Every structure is written in C-alpha cells, then in structure tokens.
Amino acid sequence: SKIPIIFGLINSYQIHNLLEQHNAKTKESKAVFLIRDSSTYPGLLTISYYCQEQDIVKHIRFGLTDKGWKTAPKPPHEPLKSDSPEIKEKYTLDKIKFERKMKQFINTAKKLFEQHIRAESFKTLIMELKIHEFNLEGLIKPTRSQASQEKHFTDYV
C-alpha cells in the first residue's frame, strides 16, 4: 500500500501552497522541497523548492544517465522587453546550445526511464539530492491521489 515519494503533474498554485504549508518560507533555501514529474519533458524529474534570496520558487530538472540521475541542461535566462541587441544575439546561441544539449539528454534519459522500471536507480536520485544539499528530512511527500503514476517510481518509496 506504499505511496511513491514522487508527485505527478501538479500545477504551479499547488506547488507554491505545498511549499508554504511545510513552512518553506521560514526555513533555509532547500530545507523543504518536493520532487515531481516534469511538466515539460516526460521522463525527467523536477525538484521544486523556495529560494530565500530571491523570494521565488525555483525548479531544477534531473534525468537518468548511465551513472544515474543527473542534472539536466539548464535553459538560458528568459528574454525581456528591455533586451538590447547584444542580449538577444547571445540568447540565440545559448538557446541553440540548450536545445541541442537537452535533445541529446532526453534521448538517453527517456531510454533509461522506459526500461528499468524496477530500479536501483532510486539510490542514485538520493545521491544527487545530497550533492545539491537538499535536506532529505524536508522532502514533502505526496498523498496517494497526488503521487506520480509513472511505473518507474512504483518502488520509489
């Protein structure tokens, strides 16, 4: 009857309310966090937490590699109305780089996500959370109806 520790596709309002319910805003950044299915890239996991320094919720994506779960390529900073041509020209190159790297990363991550449903990959997720200094005692656990229904996570308990 065990519930996975991974959330399914939850919305931004729910993510913020879960972090606030667990007092993320009165604790150090990363002291409280949740793990959910990525809503942009199937097969990836997204860690959501509160960043005290900026007073915003932040997200970091992980995907399977041959070594286990690892940090995915990060996208370049969003365009702004105020952007100068110099900003925009650099964004072009950084966006192409991000798209190329994410394409290769997803291709490998999705193949691994699909084959080892019964997974000693779980321990490698814990390792990467530790390297990123997430307080494992601060993991928010989903209720049964909110947990991921992805088969890879059935035993992520």
Numbering used by the authors: 11 to 167
Please share text taken word for word from the publication where this structure appeared.
To understand the molecular basis underlying the superbinding characteristics of the Legionella SH2 domains, we determined the structures of L. longbeachae LeSH and the L. pneumophila RavO SH2 domain in complex with tyrosine-phosphorylated peptides by X-ray crystallography. Compared to the Src SH2 domain, LeSH is missing two β-strands (βA and βF) but contains a 45-residue insert between the strand βE and the helix αB. This extra sequence in LeSH contains a structural motif called the pancreatic polypeptide (PP)-fold, comprising an amphipathic α-helix (named herein as αEF) packed against a polyproline segment via favorable hydrophobic contacts. Indeed, the SH2 and PP folds together form a clamp-like structure that grasp the pTyr residue.
Apart from the pTyr residue, which assumed the same conformation in all three complexes, we were not able to detect the electron density for residues preceding the pTyr in the DnaJ-A1 peptide or any residues flanking the pTyr in the IL2Rβ peptide despite the high resolution (1.6–1.7 Å) of the complex structures obtained. Consequently, LeSH features a rather flat surface in the equivalent P + 3/P + 4-binding area. This indicates that charge–charge interaction plays a pivotal role in the LeSH-peptide ligand interaction.
